[PDB]
Amino acid sequence: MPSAHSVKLRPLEREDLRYVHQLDSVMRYWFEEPYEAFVELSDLYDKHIHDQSERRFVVECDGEKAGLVELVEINHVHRRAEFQIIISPEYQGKGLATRAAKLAMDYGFTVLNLYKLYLIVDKENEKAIHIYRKLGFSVEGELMHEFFINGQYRNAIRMCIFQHQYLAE
Amino acid sequence: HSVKLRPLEREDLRYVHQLVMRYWFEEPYEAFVELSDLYDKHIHDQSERRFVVECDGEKAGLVELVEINHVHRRAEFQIIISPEYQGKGLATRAAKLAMDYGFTVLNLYKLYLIVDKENEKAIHIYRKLGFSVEGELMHEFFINGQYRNAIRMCIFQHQYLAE
Amino acid sequence: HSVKLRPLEREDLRYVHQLDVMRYWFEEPYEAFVELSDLYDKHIHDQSERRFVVECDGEKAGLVELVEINHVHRRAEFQIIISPEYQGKGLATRAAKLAMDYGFTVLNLYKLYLIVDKENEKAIHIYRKLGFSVEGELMHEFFINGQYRNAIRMCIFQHQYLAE
Amino acid sequence: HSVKLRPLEREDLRYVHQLVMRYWFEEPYEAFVELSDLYDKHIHDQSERRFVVECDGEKAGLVELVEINHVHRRAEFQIIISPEYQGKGLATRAAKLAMDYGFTVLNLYKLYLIVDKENEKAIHIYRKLGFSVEGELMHEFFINGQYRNAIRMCIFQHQYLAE
Amino acid sequence: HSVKLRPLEREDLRYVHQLDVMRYWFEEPYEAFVELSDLYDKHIHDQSERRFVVECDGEKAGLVELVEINHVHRRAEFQIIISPEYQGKGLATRAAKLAMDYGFTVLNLYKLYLIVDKENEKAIHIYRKLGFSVEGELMHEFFINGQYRNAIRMCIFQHQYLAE
Amino acid sequence: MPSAHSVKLRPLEREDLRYVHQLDSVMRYWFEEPYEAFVELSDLYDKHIHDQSERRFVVECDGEKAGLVELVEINHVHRRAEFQIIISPEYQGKGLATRAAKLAMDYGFTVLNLYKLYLIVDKENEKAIHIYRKLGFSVEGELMHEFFINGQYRNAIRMCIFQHQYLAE
Amino acid sequence: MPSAHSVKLRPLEREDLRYVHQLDSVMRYWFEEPYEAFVELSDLYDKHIHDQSERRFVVECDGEKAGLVELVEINHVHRRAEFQIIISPEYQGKGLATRAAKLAMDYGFTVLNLYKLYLIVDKENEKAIHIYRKLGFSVEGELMHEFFINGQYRNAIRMCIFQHQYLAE
Amino acid sequence: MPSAHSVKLRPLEREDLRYVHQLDSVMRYWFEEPYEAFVELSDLYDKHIHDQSERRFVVECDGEKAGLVELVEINHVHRRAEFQIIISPEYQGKGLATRAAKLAMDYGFTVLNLYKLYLIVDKENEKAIHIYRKLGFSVEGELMHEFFINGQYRNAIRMCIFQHQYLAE
Amino acid sequence: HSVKLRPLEREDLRYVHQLVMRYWFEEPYEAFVELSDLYDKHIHDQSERRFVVECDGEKAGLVELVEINHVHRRAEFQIIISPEYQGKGLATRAAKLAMDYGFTVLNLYKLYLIVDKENEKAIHIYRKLGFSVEGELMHEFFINGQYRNAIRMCIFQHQYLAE
Amino acid sequence: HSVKLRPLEREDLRYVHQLDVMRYWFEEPYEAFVELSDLYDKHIHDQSERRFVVECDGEKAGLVELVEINHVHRRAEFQIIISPEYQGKGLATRAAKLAMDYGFTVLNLYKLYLIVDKENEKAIHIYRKLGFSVEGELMHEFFINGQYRNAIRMCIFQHQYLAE
Amino acid sequence: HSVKLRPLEREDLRYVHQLDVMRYWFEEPYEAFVELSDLYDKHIHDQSERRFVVECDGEKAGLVELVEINHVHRRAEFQIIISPEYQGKGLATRAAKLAMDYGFTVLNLYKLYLIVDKENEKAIHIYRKLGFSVEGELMHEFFINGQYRNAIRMCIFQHQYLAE
Amino acid sequence: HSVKLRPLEREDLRYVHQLVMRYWFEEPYEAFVELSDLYDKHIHDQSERRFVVECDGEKAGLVELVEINHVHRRAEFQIIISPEYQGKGLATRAAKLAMDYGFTVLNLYKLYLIVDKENEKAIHIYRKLGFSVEGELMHEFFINGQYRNAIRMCIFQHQYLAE
Ligand SMILES: [Mg+2]
Ligand SMILES: [Mg+2]
């Protein structure tokens, strides 16, 4: 009989901040402000503790820390947010990014009462794209040369989904 | 056996946190640092008052006095028991204690509470304690995907003090 | 005659102060102007309340308060106050319609509610007409001028507004 | 003819000052800068409340609510009329007004006052308003070279509201 | 057995917190320790109150509060509290004598006074003995545990102390 | 002989703040923070004076104040920004929004050295859309129900252009 | 019939500070801290507004500003203070220093409830000394070379009086 | 052969503050501000660290802490200060107060370059008085009821000495 | 006729502003409030020093000493004349003045300047003042759509003082 | 052996302090650690400089400084320093390549430049090899250990990097 | 004509600013008024320097600076500056006498000293006359307008003043 | 054997203190808390610079550069050796080191020192290092009961660099 893992969103605590930092060279941001060194992240963190426009969860698999969900650009008048998920290397390969997306959908849609959620992914990532489609995300744009990455401008696909689709299922 | 009702101390916050969206002085929290910070910001704020419910010296739940007003002499209260302490009607004794505090110590005139309409047990309990119903608040909360109704119930100091 | 809402500027704060005995700003009490100026400065970016001067032909005629605004549960309480001299011209009615408009068509709330004196059978009727539901009768909710009074809480929903 | 009772505004301070040792929030003042400063320090302090007494729109005196407590539901009041307005029993109407405010607006249970024993007029006035005597405080004040006695008198909300 | 007053140190503040339901510091209310620590830090140089641990053979046994201290009128109110386990050994009596000593022979006050429950006929008697005068009976001065209680205010003067 | 107007971008001064405020009910934002009352705007303004992620110009026509250009979400690693233009009512009807766009293109492209600029407009605004095309903006997405406006979710068209296109002309 | 002047102590207001400053070269002090320039005095003044250990009155003669009384080193446990009076040049010669002393005695003794007041004066000032005696001040010390003044150490006479003497009269 | 103790003034460090506090009921002061609880003393201490108008030494006897010298009311224009010495109970009886006075004389006179030092003592203390005389202190005043002490006003004797007397010896 | 070189005062800022992207203490500005603020932030900063160029008492341009270093004893200078004052070789006299200040007052050893390669006039002027060329900085600035080259030129205190 | 850049953490600040006599942080001088700790705290979010520890097999081996970073003109100066004991293993070469990589493939700069002692003919040659151009010779730019020295400024461009 | 010292008020600070190229306040350099206003505000209670306007018939004529004031060693340096238009009327002489008076008869210093250009043989002579001693010749102490200059340090003592 | 000259670090303060009236940035200290505080107040102050003198890695003395000025390019220096390290002419090597730093690193033109007239050894040492005498400062210090004379001596960068 196959054993069932338990995957949970958990509100991101300060003690989680080291875990965040060491998920990894590229630009990372906190509240649209960029960081590199731990001291930069930690100070941003305290400056933004009460800020309602981003919310972050750790993904626990069986209580162990496996990755991070960031809801970002939260807007409560237009009832949307963007999300971003990131799975620690030793937790990849086993459907986590998927479950993890379902859980963030659940959070924005059933807890936070947003109307629309979207995400950006590399145009190159035919894998992820197709998964999101599977879950019934529409494609709403192909941003051209939106990111300059490892020496080169890359294209992003923005894909959205809606509260009613979600609750209908 | 023994249930006291101790003021909420800063060491109690990690306990509090370890019990859907939560409010401290009407400002929302999720992280423990969010609530901790919020806590010190509202240290001398008289508009809310909190107590750990102690069973035989162990921390077993929480009473909140919220929206305390001394001109109109009223306040709201929420009571929360930890799972492992539920279903011995601490929820009940805690309610009496809250009532004792607000009516005999704080000298309030009126105490009210909100509860999900569906919670027929609580509604019954409080009616037993002689609370009367004053409202059915339609779709007052978005809870886990859905709007829910609450029932608000009150009781008055003269009713209590009949004791 | 024409009637508009307008965000409340510090310059309006003197006007607000003297509509006449007990009142609040961002839930803290106030009486003197200095008390009020101070709260106002403190709550400049507080999202949980939003105010408006009610303008009647470019003239300050009253005030709309949007209070206890919650965006997760998409609701908010409102209250209107009309300077003595603009009363009895159905102005608080037009102001109500306008506050609904704002919370429903701009703030994107789901539910708006208010509390009035049970005794005010008149206002009560005006709301019922507008399609508001009674959602409760609070007993002795307010000590006012020497006695406890009852109030009625009445609510209306976005979809009812966007329909009719 | 007309007597209102307006909240004390900052413009009123120069008036206040222009009326032996004075107290603001139990801290003493003499200079106007001493009182002014003190004033802002106690802006959101609910423990005292002040009003100018207005006769036909002119500033004519002062009511102070001091030591306001909402659990025991009581407060003290001092009333001060400016000379040119004395002896028309504004002192009286002012007292009623204070009483009106504390009992019908602020929802206090009990109001008391201190007055020099020797002030037989005030003592009589208040007894007329139905205040009862609760103490003769021996040498409670050093005033102009000498200890003086005060009389403390109270009245209760139920007594007033009989109206 | 020997009994002393001792100025109250921050280290005593944990002791003070748990003598058991409503209390004050420099006239502001408190309940939680964090609330109390804070007031204490704020009032460090406040001249208007002075506190002391009552030490019984080098052991913390209670507390003396000197409150509403006025130096122009040379008076001050006092209150004593004895930990449950040191009561009924005439300790609050020795503590009273000691507080008088301090206000009279050190602070140079002219008058000291206190307030007790009218119902506490015992304490009342102890003070009368010490030469205290009743200077008033306050009616329903305190809402306590469900009802308004009466209190008695009793005073004594320096010259009476320095004589007897 | 037809008289030539002079249209200029001018760096936005504090004294311009009243003009901004009174360009008008809808949500307006300053540095992604929302305002309504003048005191809210003015305080945001001082809080963000040195912030490199938004830049604002007044459009002077013949030295008189005619409208406002906001470059927003400026990113210097991905070399882009979003722009927004707004023409005062008495200056509409006479090609200003157009010239005004050309000028902001010039600023980002020739002064600020961005690589890409884009804009959002109402899907409904077939007029503006076609103009931007005329100037050789590509369409890069149709965001669905992105804004809730006057009681109703509306659709936006994001359209971009690039430094090389611009300098080529 | 000779006309009676009215001489009053008045609590020192900030607007009085210029008058103080220009009562005049020597060391002057405010709360035991020294001043020379107006800005020094004014800043000391604000730093010490609530300080209970010095109190200052202006002497009004017929409502016009004639001089200054400083009660200094106020101690409420030992119930004493030192006083110092200073009469503006155009108000000297007409008994003011005297009345002015009586008034400060009245203030400390009948208002402030001190038990003892004293003063220092130049040993050289046989005039003032004898006046204070007249008013029944005892001599309680002759401080030797206590002040270095205009190139030279000078001797001071400290003289005291008591509440009971005063009220007895 | 009798063994010689070494008695030294040492600048008072913060760690000395507990020792000070526990030299003992009466009013004690720090920079003319009164203290009782340790937290009061310690906060005064930090508020006054750089203040030139009081200086304090510990008296070490053989390196062990035996008492305290306070130079107080230091005035560098009139070149004087008052001093106060206090010997811990277990170090009394063995000439310390004496040596300790000589050392403070040495400090003010030979290090600090004051011209005059004085002290107050109880009129009742015929012992100390006579010692100071022995060292050639003049008596310069008998302050009457200057201190209210243990229920009663007491009289003080102020006694001074001068740099030239001292260096002459 | 007369050219002084006055220290830059706060009243001069509106003038400064009224003269592509500008820098104050290596931080960029455009609005006047941006530069004003920046100005006070760098009031006691010794690393840059500024002067208005005064012709017969009127404000006519600007000298900036920038990147001032006292161990290596060097600094950079920019000079800016207002249009209506250009082409009388104030640019020249201003340069001499800068040179006078840095070499005879500030005791610098070396002064250098950057100028667009294309500005053949400036390059010539300075070579005339005996500045020598020390670099051709390739595409050192993006200016109005294009990378541009600058030429850096220096001169030394001993060379100047030969005077 | 493997070599990486890594953002510089406060924990690295002690390491940085002791590579041996005159140096800067965000253009302000420093000597003592306390001086340095302070500048570092002040410049935490300063975009104009970016630093990195050079790691050799997970071991701290040196430092890369990106200085005078300008994003409008898309350039920045760089400098590398290798702890005494890691020198002469072509490590500063690998570190240079890595700094180019970062400014060119991550920061998206157009131009990177450096300044070396004219006398250092060795380093100079290493850069020329890498495709760097000499863009100037600064005369007596640095007073160092008793005399003014000359320096060379050499630059390279993104397109040259992204090509070869 | 009559000549007085007068403590320097903020109102004098504009006057001070324009006597014409390098100068200090409480040892920090300044040039612009804003720079100076700031130092002045910072040093309001600094005991180590004391300034005075030199008044000639109630008119501002120059300035006296008392600098490096040390009370333990009882000395202080002084400097005088006279507005162009009041020079050559022996005014700096009367101002010197007055500064001596102040430090000697008011501040109770033991020693006062000054530094002048060796080349200024005139001033030098005026001081010698006043009884000042040369206590040193500092070599190349000042870089001024293009070259290092020598200065002379001359001192006088209280007892010499209080005698003659 | 080995003498380095390390910058003064905060851990070195307790050492410093453990070496009559002392000055930090011309402000006086005695307690260690007085000097410690003063220390942080002057952390970025360029007007003074300090170094521990290290003999074979142990702390053995102190060089102070004081009154550093970069326009006139001069500074003063005091050197202090701890007793147990005296009389091996570390005082000498330390002096050379100071000289090395100010002249070859800091690019000063001139260095001077003050020493009690009576210290004939120091005076001789420095004259040997080729310092010349520029003043005999009469009663410049009150030291242990008496005014004392100091001798000031300087040397110049060109003289040193002759090396
Ligand atoms: Mg954004
Ligand atoms: Mg004193």
Chain discontinuities in chain B, listed by preceding residue (C to N exceeding 2.5 Å):
19
Alpha-carbon distance of E71 to G112, in angstroms, equals 9
CA atoms within 13 Å, Cβ hemisphere of H49: 18
Mutate to test the interface with A, among F27, F53, F77 (most CBs of A within 10 A): F77
Alpha-carbon distance of K113 to K134, in angstroms, equals 10
CA distances (Å), F151 to each of C131, D50, F157, J98, in order? Answer: 18, 47, 20, 54
Q: What is the DSSP letter of A21?
A: H
B-E contacts at Cβ under 8 angstroms: 27
Decide: B49 and B9 in contact? Cβ < 8 Å.
no
Residue-wise over F67-83: b if at least 16 C-beta within 10 A, else e?
bbbbbbebbbbbbbbbb
Q: What is the DSSP string of G70-113?
A: EEEEEETTTTEEEEEEEE-GGGTTSSHHHHHHHHHHHIIIIIS-
Alpha-carbon distance of K143 to L12, in angstroms, equals 35
What the block records as the tokens of F15 is 């004294």
**Pairwise CB contact (< 8 Å): E105 & H40:** no
Taking the alpha carbons of F96, F101, F102, F103 in that order, is the dihedral positive or negative? Answer: positive
User: Strand, coil or helix: what is L125?
Assistant: helix
Does the beta carbon of L148 lie under 8 angstroms from any beta carbon of chain K?
A: no
> Residue written as tokens 């209908």?
A168
List the one residue out of J51, J10, J52 whose CA is nearest residue J33: J10
Burial (Cβ within 10 Å: 0-12, 13-18, ≥19) of residue D52: buried
Pairing relation of β-strands G153-162 and C50-56?
unpaired
Q: Do chains H and L touch (3 or more CB pairs under 8 A)?
A: yes
Q: Where are the beta strands (DSSP E) in I11-48?
A: 22-24, 27-29
Decide: K143 and L71 in contact? Cβ < 8 Å.
yes
What the block records as the tokens of L96 is 């050379």
Burial (Cβ within 10 Å: 0-12, 13-18, ≥19) of residue G57: buried
Pairing relation of β-strands L74-81 and F153-162?
unpaired
Binding residues of F for Mg(2+): 32, 73
Q: Where are the alpha helices (DSSP H) in chain A?
A: 17-21, 38-47, 96-106, 126-134, 163-168
Pairing relation of β-strands F64-75 and A7-11?
unpaired
CA triplet D97, D99, D102: central angle to 5 degrees? 110
Contacts for H166 with CB less than 8 Å, ≥ 6 apart: H105, H109, H110
Alpha-carbon distance of L31 to L36, in angstroms, equals 9
Contacts for I10 with CB less than 8 Å, ≥ 6 apart: I39, K32, K33, K34
Q: F50 contacts in J (CB within 8 Å)? A: none
Does the beta carbon of F113 lie under 8 angstroms from any beta carbon of chain J?
A: yes
Decide: G53 and G73 in contact? Cβ < 8 Å.
yes
Mutate to test the interface with K, among H76, H107, H110 (most CBs of K within 10 A): H76
Does the beta carbon of D19 lie under 8 angstroms from any beta carbon of chain G?
A: no
Q: What is the DSSP letter of K31?
A: -
CA distances (Å), K138 to each of K67, K147, L100, in order? Answer: 18, 14, 22
| Phi, psi values for residue L119, rounded to 5° | -70, 70
Element of type H or E holding I36? helix I32-41
CATH code of A39's domain: 3.40.630.30
List the one residue out of G156, G159, G48, G57 whose CA is nearest residue G106: G57
Element of type H or E holding L34? helix L32-41
Alpha-carbon distance of G57 to G101, in angstroms, equals 12
Element of type H or E holding E103? helix E91-105
Burial (Cβ within 10 Å: 0-12, 13-18, ≥19) of residue I26: middle
Residue-wise over J92-115: b if at least 16 C-beta within 10 A, else e?
bbbbbebbbbbbbbbbbbbbbbbb
CA distances (Å), C48 to each of C30, C110, H12, I95, L48, in order? Answer: 18, 15, 55, 60, 54
What the block records as the tokens of L86 is 């005296």
Chain E: nearest CA to B39, how far in angstroms? Answer: 10
Closest J-chain CA to L12: J32
Phi-psi region of E140 (alpha: psi -120 to 50; beta: other; left: phi over 0): left
Alpha-carbon distance of H104 to H71, in angstroms, equals 8
**Pairwise CB contact (< 8 Å): D134 & E138:** yes
List the one residue out of E45, D97, L143 whose CA is nearest residue H34: E45
| Phi, psi values for residue C87, rounded to 5° | -70, 155
How many other C-beta atoms are found inside a 10 Å radius of the C-beta of residue L87? 10
> Residue written as tokens 């001192």?
K155
Element of type H or E holding L65? strand L58-69
CA distances (Å), H86 to each of H24, H60, H83, L157, in order? Answer: 11, 12, 10, 55
Q: Where are the beta strands (DSSP E) in J8-146?
A: 23-25, 28-30, 50-56, 59-70, 75-82, 111-117, 133-144
Contacts for G55 with CB less than 8 Å, ≥ 6 apart: D30, G70, G71, G74, G112
Q: At what angle do helices F96-106 and F126-134 cross, to 10 degrees?
A: 50
- The residue type of D104 is T
Alpha-carbon distance of I75 to I155, in angstroms, equals 11
Decide: G20 and G38 in contact? Cβ < 8 Å.
no
Pairing relation of β-strands H116-122 and H80-87?
parallel
Alpha-carbon distance of D31 to B3, in angstroms, equals 55
CA atoms within 13 Å, Cβ hemisphere of F97: 14
User: Strand, coil or helix: what is F149?
Assistant: coil
CA distances (Å), A121 to each of A83, A84, A125, A140, A152, in order? Answer: 11, 9, 7, 12, 16
In Å, how far from its chain's centre is CA D104?
17
Which of F14, F49, F111 has the CB atom closest to I21's CB atom? F111
List the one residue out of A117, A4, A110, A107 whose CA is nearest residue A57: A107
Contacts for K124 with CB less than 8 Å, ≥ 6 apart: K116, K118, K152, K154
Q: What is the DSSP letter of C10?
A: G
Chain A: nearest CA to F62, how far in angstroms? Answer: 37
CA atoms within 13 Å, Cβ hemisphere of I114: 16
- The residue type of H51 is D
CA atoms within 13 Å, Cβ hemisphere of L19: 23
List the one residue out of J87, J44, J96 whose CA is nearest residue J65: J96
- The residue type of G160 is C
What the block records as the tokens of H136 is 């050639």
Alpha-carbon distance of C77 to C103, in angstroms, equals 10
List the one residue out of K76, K79, K53, K54 whose CA is nearest residue K65: K79
Terminal CA-CA length for chain D: 22
When computed from its CA atoms, the radius of gyration of chain L, rounded to whole angstroms, is 16
Active site residues of H: 132
**Pairwise CB contact (< 8 Å): G38 & K108:** no
CA A53 / ligand 1 centre spacing (Å): 10
CA triplet J5, J11, J16: central angle to 5 degrees? 65
- Please give the torsion angle defined by the CA atoms of residues D23, D29, D32 and D35, in that order, rounded to the nearest 10 degrees: -50
Per DSSP, what are the bridge partners of residue J112? J76, J156
> Residue written as tokens 């659709």?
F155
Which of B28, B33, B145 has the CB atom closest to A13's CB atom? B33
List the one residue out of J132, J102, J157, F166 whose CA is nearest residue I139: J157
Per DSSP, what are the bridge partners of residue K139? none
Q: Which ligand is nearest to the CA of A32?
A: 1
| Phi, psi values for residue D100, rounded to 5° | -60, -50
CA distances (Å), K44 to each of C77, F157, K8, K47, K124, in order? Answer: 55, 62, 11, 9, 33
Burial (Cβ within 10 Å: 0-12, 13-18, ≥19) of residue K74: buried
User: Which experimental technique did the depositors report for determining this structure?
Assistant: X-ray
**Pairwise CB contact (< 8 Å): F162 & A145:** yes
Contacts for C148 with CB less than 8 Å, ≥ 6 apart: B72, B109, C140, C141, C142
Domain, as residue range, for B26 = 1-163
Contacts for G37 with CB less than 8 Å, ≥ 6 apart: K7, K8, K9, K10, K44
Residues in J 21-60 with any Cβ partner in F closer than 8 A: 47
User: Strand, coil or helix: what is H65?
Assistant: strand
> Residue written as tokens 């607006």?
D105
- The residue type of J27 is E
- The residue type of C122 is K
Contacts for K120 with CB less than 8 Å, ≥ 6 apart: none
Contacts for I162 with CB less than 8 Å, ≥ 6 apart: none
Chain J: nearest CA to I75, how far in angstroms? Answer: 10
Pairing relation of β-strands D110-116 and H153-162?
unpaired
- Please give the torsion angle defined by the CA atoms of residues L26, L27, L31 and L37, in that order, rounded to the nearest 10 degrees: -110
Decide: D27 and D38 in contact? Cβ < 8 Å.
yes
Contacts for J118 with CB less than 8 Å, ≥ 6 apart: J124, J137, J149, J150, J151, J152
Which of J22, J48, J136 has the CB atom closest to I152's CB atom? J136
In Å, how far from its chain's centre is CA K153?
13
Active site residues of D: 126
Alpha-carbon distance of G1 to F154, in angstroms, equals 95
Decide: L58 and H39 in contact? Cβ < 8 Å.
no
CA atoms within 13 Å, Cβ hemisphere of B134: 23
Contacts for L36 with CB less than 8 Å, ≥ 6 apart: L13
Total domains, chain D = 1
Q: What is the DSSP letter of G118?
A: E
User: Strand, coil or helix: what is J65?
Assistant: strand
How many other C-beta atoms are found inside a 10 Å radius of the C-beta of residue H99? 15
List the one residue out of L100, L157, L87, L152 whose CA is nearest residue L126: L152
List the one residue out of A80, A59, A73 whose CA is nearest residue A29: A73
List the one residue out of K131, K139, K137, K138 whose CA is nearest residue K155: K131
Taking the alpha carbons of E119, E123, E128, E133 in that order, is the dihedral positive or negative? Answer: negative
**Pairwise CB contact (< 8 Å): H141 & G158:** yes
CA F116 / ligand 1 centre spacing (Å): 16
Per DSSP, what are the bridge partners of residue D52? D6, D62
User: Strand, coil or helix: what is C12?
Assistant: helix
Decide: D156 and D131 in contact? Cβ < 8 Å.
no
Q: Where are the alpha helices (DSSP H) in chain J?
A: 13-17, 33-42, 91-105, 121-130, 158-163
Alpha-carbon distance of B69 to D70, in angstroms, equals 10
> Residue written as tokens 């139990």?
D26
Decide: I53 and I97 in contact? Cβ < 8 Å.
yes
Alpha-carbon distance of A10 to D159, in angstroms, equals 59
Mutate to test the interface with B, among C22, C139, C145, C149 (most CBs of B within 10 A): C139
- Please give the torsion angle defined by the CA atoms of residues F105, F111, F116 and F122, in that order, rounded to the nearest 10 degrees: -30
Chain discontinuities in chain K, listed by preceding residue (C to N exceeding 2.5 Å):
20
